[PDB]
């Protein structure tokens, strides 16, 4: 049933994942010297290409491939349209490895046909709390703790095959070449997410949406006006009032994050993230890169009242092309990114996220039920969607965990 995934070092069934007790590698250890030095073979009409993410033009070629051929729902309503500014941000964090950006082009016209990207991440991925308890009970602490140290691994994202080349087994060849390039840098694990079920997730969570511009959403969504608004005389007026937000933030002291905030944001975020079983560790340079505001891409506010930063939140922008509409070309979504609250309740911090996003002309705020996101779903009027984000590791055995034990946000 999986001609490619059956050949890879990943858990092969749900049952296998539910029986794993300790974190650790799937494969026995290899060295960089064991790994082929030459690119994986490809058909003579194609060639491997390493785009330069410094170069505006190479970013633009990747942007167009993804604009026309990236993730689209099963009803062909929406397709993500990550901006060029976003792809530069995502693809070039501190100490990124250019070789981990892997593309296929047609040899004749140099048309870009496929892409996949890896970036570095430092991840806590040792045995989860509930499994460490089971291990202490049985005198197996030392085994359970062996891979507790944060590991410098690869995060994979942006896998894409052009629509004309679908179902030709090109995605496996991109996955193999990316694995080769990562392994030749002495990295042996990756983390990735997908909205589809593959073998085999260690965690899965539903997506949640909070309408910010419900009229637009009703024009473009399959279901809007949501049917349960039909018992009213004016369904649309009741829908608008349901989702209405204040026009200005409520936390006194909220302001945009600035470079001097980096060390305090790093500290409050690290203290919060360290409570979860799977989560990143960020250097000051990675806090600066992923959290300082960047126009049209990432938006980050701190609560500082008395010249001390006690709270912050961030969101990032992913527009989608709206495939079948007269009125609207684009859906402007704000996705909840990292946050930390030490002085106000999390729901009060995130309400100011919604207030800012709405003031800036976003249509919807999205998130997955990771972190403590479930804590404010009902009061802030998020609704579950149809989708699930599934979290995976490559070459890492890991017990099944709840998505409220995952602290890694995927872009
Ligand atoms: C140590 C370092 C390791 C680094 C590598 C770590 C692994 C990284 C893994 C990648 C994480 C990516 C994270 C993201 O970016 S998730 C976003 C994925 N992108 C899209 O959904 C964009 C639109 N769709 C497409 O571009 C294509 O349909 C793709 C490229 C998805 C498949 O192309 P195509 O439809 O033309 O099919 P094929 O004939 O070439 O290939 C068929 C094989 O592909 C398997 N498949 C289908 N979807 C996915 C998927 N989302 N992750 C992994 N595998 C996938 C499928 O099970 C089958 O294998 P098997 O069932 O027969 O065995
Ligand atoms: C985030 C999953 S839903 C989705 C949106 C989205 O934000 N929506 C659509 C429903 O109206 C408001 C919220 C926007 N553009 C998309 C583009 C592709 C797509 O493919 C399905 C998918 C399912 C799970 C995870 C990722 C993608 C879904 C969406
Ligand atoms: Mg293919």
Residue numbers in the entry: 11 to 421
Which sentences from the paper describe this structure?
N-Myristoyltransferase (NMT, EC 2.3.1.97) catalyses the transfer of the fatty acid chain C14:0 from myristoyl coenzyme A (MyrCoA) to the N-terminal glycine residue of substrate proteins. This co- and post-translational modification is ubiquitous in eukaryotic organisms and plays a central role in a variety of cellular processes such as the addressing and reversible anchoring of proteins to membranes. In particular, NMT has been validated as a pharmacological target in fungal infections, in a range of parasitic diseases caused by Trypanosoma,7Leishmania8 and Plasmodium protozoa and filarial nematodes, and as a potential target for the treatment of cancer. Herein, we report the synthesis and the structure-guided optimization of a series of quinolines with balanced activity against both Plasmodium vivax and Plasmodium falciparum N-myristoyltransferase (NMT).
